[PDB]
Design a binder for this molecule. Sequence first.
Ligand SMILES: [Mg+2]
Ligand SMILES: [Mg+2]
Ligand SMILES: [Mg+2]
Ligand SMILES: [Mg+2]
Ligand SMILES: [Mg+2]
Lengths: 222, 125, 222, 195, 195, 196, 196, 226, 204, 212
Amino acid sequence: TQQPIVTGTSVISMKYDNGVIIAADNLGSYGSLLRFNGVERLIPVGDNTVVGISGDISDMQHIERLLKDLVTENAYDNPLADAEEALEPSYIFEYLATVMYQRRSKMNPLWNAIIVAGVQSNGDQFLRYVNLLGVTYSSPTLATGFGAHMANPLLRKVVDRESDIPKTTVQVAEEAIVNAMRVLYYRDARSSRNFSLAIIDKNTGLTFKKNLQVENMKWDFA
Amino acid sequence: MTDRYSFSLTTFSPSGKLGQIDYALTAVKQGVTSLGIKATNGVVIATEKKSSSPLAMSETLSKVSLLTPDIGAVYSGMGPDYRVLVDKSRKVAHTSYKRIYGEYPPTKLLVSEVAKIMQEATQSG
Amino acid sequence: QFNPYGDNGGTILGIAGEDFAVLAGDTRNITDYSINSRYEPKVFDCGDNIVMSANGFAADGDALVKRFKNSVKWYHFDHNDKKLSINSAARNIQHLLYGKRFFPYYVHTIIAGLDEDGKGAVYSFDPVGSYEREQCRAGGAAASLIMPFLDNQVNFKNQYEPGTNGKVKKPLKYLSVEEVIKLVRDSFTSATERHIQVGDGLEILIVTKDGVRKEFYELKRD
Amino acid sequence: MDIILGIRVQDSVILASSKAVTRGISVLKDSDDKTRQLSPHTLMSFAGEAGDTVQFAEYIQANIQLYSIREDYELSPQAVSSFVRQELAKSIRSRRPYQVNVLIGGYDKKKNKPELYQIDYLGTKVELPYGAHGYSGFYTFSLLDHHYRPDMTTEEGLDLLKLCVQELEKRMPMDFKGVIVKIVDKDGIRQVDDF
Amino acid sequence: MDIILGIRVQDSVILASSKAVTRGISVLKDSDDKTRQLSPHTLMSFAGEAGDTVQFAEYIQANIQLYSIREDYELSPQAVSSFVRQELAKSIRSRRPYQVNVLIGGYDKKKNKPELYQIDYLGTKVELPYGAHGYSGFYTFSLLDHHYRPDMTTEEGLDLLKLCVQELEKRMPMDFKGVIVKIVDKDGIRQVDDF
Amino acid sequence: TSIMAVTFKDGVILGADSRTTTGAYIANRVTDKLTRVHDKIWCCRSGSAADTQAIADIVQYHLELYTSQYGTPSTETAASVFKELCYENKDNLTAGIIVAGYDDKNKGEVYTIPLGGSVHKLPYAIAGSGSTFIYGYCDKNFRENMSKEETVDFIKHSLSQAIKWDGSSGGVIRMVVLTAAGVERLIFYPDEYEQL
Amino acid sequence: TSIMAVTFKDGVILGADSRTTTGAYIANRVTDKLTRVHDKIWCCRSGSAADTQAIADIVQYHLELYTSQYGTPSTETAASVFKELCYENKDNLTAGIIVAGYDDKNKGEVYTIPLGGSVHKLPYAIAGSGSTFIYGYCDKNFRENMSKEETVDFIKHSLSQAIKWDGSSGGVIRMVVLTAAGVERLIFYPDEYEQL
Amino acid sequence: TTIVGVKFNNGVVIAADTRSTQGPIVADKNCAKLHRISPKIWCAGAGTAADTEAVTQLIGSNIELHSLYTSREPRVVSALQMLKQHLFKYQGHIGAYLIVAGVDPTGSHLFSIHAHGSTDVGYYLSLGSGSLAAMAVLESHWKQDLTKEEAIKLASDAIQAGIWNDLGSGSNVDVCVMEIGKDAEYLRNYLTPNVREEKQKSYKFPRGTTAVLKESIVNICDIQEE
Amino acid sequence: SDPSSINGGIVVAMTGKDCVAIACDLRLGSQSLGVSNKFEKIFHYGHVFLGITGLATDVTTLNEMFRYKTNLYKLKEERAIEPETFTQLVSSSLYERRFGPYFVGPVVAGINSKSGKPFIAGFDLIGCIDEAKDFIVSGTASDQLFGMCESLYEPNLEPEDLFETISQALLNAADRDALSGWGAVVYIIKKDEVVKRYLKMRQD
Amino acid sequence: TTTLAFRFQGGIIVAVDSRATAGNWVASQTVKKVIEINPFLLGTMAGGAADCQFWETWLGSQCRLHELREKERISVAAASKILSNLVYQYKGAGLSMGTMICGYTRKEGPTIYYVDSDGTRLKGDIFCVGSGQTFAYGVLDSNYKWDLSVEDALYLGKRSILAAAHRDAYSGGSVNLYHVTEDGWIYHGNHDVGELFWKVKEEEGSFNNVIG
Ligand SMILES: [Mg+2]
Ligand SMILES: [Mg+2]
Ligand SMILES: [Mg+2]
Ligand SMILES: [Mg+2]
Ligand SMILES: [Mg+2]
């Protein structure tokens, strides 16, 4: 049992016709002190997976090292490490989900909420959540912390059920994600203007966007 | 200070008369005429706006007053006494009825409450 | 202080017919006043014509189902591919649950299938492994809303034959699979109206001698 | 205090109340009478917190005696029980509530009927053929449910009461030092001096 | 459990132990024998937490019986009491201590003397002419202090014991359902079947 | 909350952020924390929003009744009324108020009333959760008898840093200028002050 | 405690106050909070004195054994060893450590390890109870590639303000300069920095 | 509960969902959360339902008497001042969280008020368990100079976000539009997107199914003549 | 310890075509101990019916209080109180004890004598009115009653059909609650006749 | 819950109710509170359902191993002590158990041991355990004789559970009866309390307080 010290806020994500999008801001809070302003909370694994992490940053850095070690280990005595026997999003998630549940079962959790976003070998979209309790679930849109309360309602207006996914383009999905990040900046006291966004597409691969900013803000009416 | 008049100012005379009530009725007699007529589908109340001066704006002096949305009142006698009774009648319609039953009082019961206030000014100290 | 438990809501229902059994559950997953997923499967085909659901804390639920599925696999390895009978599965699940008697799986487990005479069977478990064969059992959030209705409409409790005035009970005539499914759907429709954690979708698994079949129905999403 | 029982038979009400008074470690008395006569045909037994029991009982007694003198009339058992209930219902929301449970056994001279009322410290009143307070009912009600008849004589009521006390003496951990038994009927109130 | 008494007279040790076993609300048994024979001339009575009492007593019994067989010799009462004390002194600093208080009544065949040892759950041992555990001493010791003589016969010891039990039955709130009485002397251990 | 008041050559200026939080949720991102109790006597509020609004309303009432009887009150008098309420009800209040005003006789004055209900007359004052992060900056950069433009820059830069580090502070920077010329309201948006 | 480390053109400088308190009593007014773990790798300690001393001694041991086998360790390696101890024993430690070092390949580097045991590489870092009061000042005044004299002035002015407002900080300002030229110790007394 | 308030061109609109709950159980599926303080001053309440109703009716009552005394139509700032001073006095023990909106001779107004007595001003506000879902919609689509039709659309969309995403909210959308120089129009069940589907079975019993011990006529009439 | 579940019991009310029904169990207990099987929880003042669940001393007190108040109402108004008016009186009376409340769950049922319209209403312990068109439930088996009513109820049932529906709702709900049962009563209410029926049920 | 067991001339009668509750909520009316340890031994369920089920099935396994090893039926004394020694090992950990281990052997005759989760092991003639135990004791104590017939003893056990089911809110559903002989136990059916109550009321004349 511990308490989180340096923390990261919401991670938000959704599925679209050809893949998945995931986003998270670049802040590491120390209570109400906005201490660290250049923290990357989206961690890519290969060219098919991005793991987004909120909560305790020290535990995030530990998980980041586990994933780095996972890639090294998979390459050992594996001639098809960059082909048929490369790490899948589903492999990476199941490993993390195992670790999270084991750690909570020893009463020593990794104090995080994690979203694994990626595209499988057969082109299928992968999007699944796991947290400090080992609780897992999937949905066309997924979000952690404040994002769950404010981003999901907006993202669900675009993709409300499974049949909406093929009707949703990457432009519409990214637009919805970017708008949600603006809304979170308005209303979450532990958020920042600077964020990262990652698109994993079955055709164009992994696009990782750094140093994005919330723009087109309204205040005037004050 | 303190109100040291804790005794009745209206009392029975040897003949059984309550002087102050009789004299109050005399003040009413001097007052401007007001009337009321009940029809099958309504009631009308009316009075004269006896303007004290032509420079006075008699529209600002309301002799006919709304007590509830379905109850109105008019008077004859002392105007200021009427005005404060209207304030008390409006309030008692809420405190002793609307805040209890969630509806405005029936005419006879509001009348009863106003009557009780007037009775008490005839016996209280 | 770290709380190793959580409540993911959900409501499940098992009914044993004459030569069939159904295990149904809603597809909504929640924490507090938020929806995690509108479709997160809760009832699982575990092989050997056995269906299972462990409702309550979803992390413990997933862990138990996973360990039971594994137990079926190893039963085949160790005992010459012998079919695991529903009574044997039930006793096995008791030991899985009681193994964590002093740090329990926070779930209410129900399994369904056919016994060795081909008759419909439902077993019900408490969190620490006490179990019983039952004809009718609802579990989870809206169990208290559903069970009285089932007592009345399946077992004909408090119903007497007209004209006799309480002297002759309404006879307990056997229900078809179509009749049971009607009662399941009406149970969940009513539970959806009056319980905030019940909704989104209803998934029913039907077990006969021919195997396991699935049926899905929409529920109100508010 | 501890055990108080009541049973309404054909023509009378019988109240049985334990004799022990225990102050923690020692039994200070073994002949305590946990009852007060409210009027010639109305008896009230009581149990609860020390001091408050007798204080409440004597307060009720004084009030009913005052009514009797003012009106030159004995209130019905129903009327007395309603007065008592209101006093306890008033008490439960007071600064310091009376922690007192009572049984009221009375013979209504107008209706020519015995009546037994059970009232707890919250002001929860019920009219019963037989009643108790505390754990007394847990041991005795299964016997009363079996044997009780509305047309029982006073002697049969006393015999059923003896069976109840015997079961209490067998299975109860505490020694309540027996019971004082009193009968309320058309002729008034009397004590059974051998039980 | 509840009351255990002991008295050492001229030529014997007498142990008196209550018969009641109470599990909270109900008295489950009224004939329980709260004693174990450790050797032909050594008896141990016991009281404390449920389960641990019998578990401890039978454990001690097994150990003394083992010693008796190995050496073909009966340990002196003093030696047995020292063994028991050490076990309880060891127990009090354990993960979960034995919550058991004992009296050991034995006749030393070498010295031709009766001996009574009182040991509580902490491992506090004292040799006494008479002893008790719990609240039993509070009611009985003033009587024993007055009447006790070291040259009393067994019959006089039993009479003084009856007076002690009578005082317990009068002033104790709990019904302990009487006592089983056993005598330890040169001929061994026997039970007084009418008390 | 980040609030401050600064005296300068021509009078006094009050400054504040506009963020009101319930835990980590921003309940209002455009709050007005600069409150008028008299024509040229204003205050900055911190602590319980309910308490500080209640106090300010009572003060405004007191100074309105004072004015009807005795004419325009001094800034010291206003601070005294604030103090009386804060000190006497210290057990039931969580309020940190800065009082700022302009007289013609006394010119610009600033009084700070912290939690306990004590009064401290200062050349400038800072308060609220965000103020902790700018004690160093404000002490190094404050000068007496600054110009209007300098004081606006000092407050804008100071609250900019307070907003940057304090999660409980943010939104727009509001300012109210109190001089002989009258009362001027100023507002500065994030795109302006974040690039400072 | 007020501690900081700042990278500059020629390397890195560590700074610290010298006050150690037990409640309101100053147990030591001349404490040395700048600790050597290797020739040109030093650290600033904050939190439990027992914990941070224990950690530093273990790190010094680890880097001494590293050097005997593999040659001079990098500043990143030293920070990693600190982190490993802080992260794995987070339940039983109260330690906030800033690690600063000079390589010839990497030049001046600063790593901060807050309570949780996370690592953050920064151009400069501030920590300790007194650091809260100089977030605004340091953010406004820090520039990259400053000269030695400028960096000394930046640290001297920063810790001066931290000492001024924080009761838990005080005494002398100590500094350790890490460059290619070697290791230089500096000390600045109250009569010097209080008049800044 | 989800409640919102939105300012527009010539007035203000407020809306609310219609679900009231006891823990996880839905007590009433078509609750009325829009209350009238005066003809053209309306408010919506979240928190303790009895408190929101009681504090509305008390201030509404006193507002009516004040209107009669002063011969003037009630003002929103009067309702606001009376509400906050009442709530502050009870130190949050009256669990009323309200959005107050209305028109009066001064213009159109929109305020929020919390249980401890603090108040706010805004062009758009949301309260209740679904306030974060509602505010997400408001922050995404609100603009200056909204028309009446645009404001009604935005308000109901914000309530819908609460209905679908917040478990504490559900059923229907109620709306009230207060425009300057017009009667306030209360639109009860403005949207109805949650009608229950027809059941698979009728559960009407055969007559005589229930066992009965005794029957008797209950005298509800007064004591009779003769 | 929880005052609303010391004594146990349930009340349910339903509307039908030109009729209303209100029903209750007969149990009074002291937690696990059953004390009385004749504790009726439905009362009437003229043609207005009031069911009350919860702490039994408050049930009795409130009945006496509303008898008191409706008697004075009648003397002054010269007419019997209506269900709509009485509902407001119950709410007013409960809220006056806001910070020391009666631990009860009242239910009002009746037909307006002038309009003929069927009326039901429910309250929490502090006076908040639930005016449902279909049904109102209250007591220690309210969850069970919600489940029964939601599936069994349909609008515009005839008086004798409504009796079966409400009876089966009560009975089966009570049989899933330890603290409810021990007998039951059902009132069928029409504009100028009311029938009272005691039901046969299991006595455990 | 209400469970009882008593010794008599013809062996042992075991009678239990069928109700399980979670707070006020009646979870089940069809619970099996008699555990069939083997064809000769019975145990009763009270306290923790799982603890009783699990460890008394386990006891059956230990009894089976004993008779395989020793080629002889295990005594009730030995069987009960295996259980009591086991739960004593767990003392403090939070097991909840109150059970009667019932059997009839050659050397012992009909024997009942009350075994309990704090380590208690008591031999006795009549035991009654559960929330409704006091009600059942009343009927038992006033009607019990050693020389009861098997028919009358079975009824007494049935009637005593009914008494508890009526008064105790947490007892009811149905009554399960068993008769333990030297050649094994014999099941004597499931009896719905609802139907049983009215039947007993009419035939016996009892429960005059209740209208039927
Ligand atoms: Mg919803
Ligand atoms: Mg330490
Ligand atoms: Mg200092
Ligand atoms: Mg029941
Ligand atoms: Mg029962």
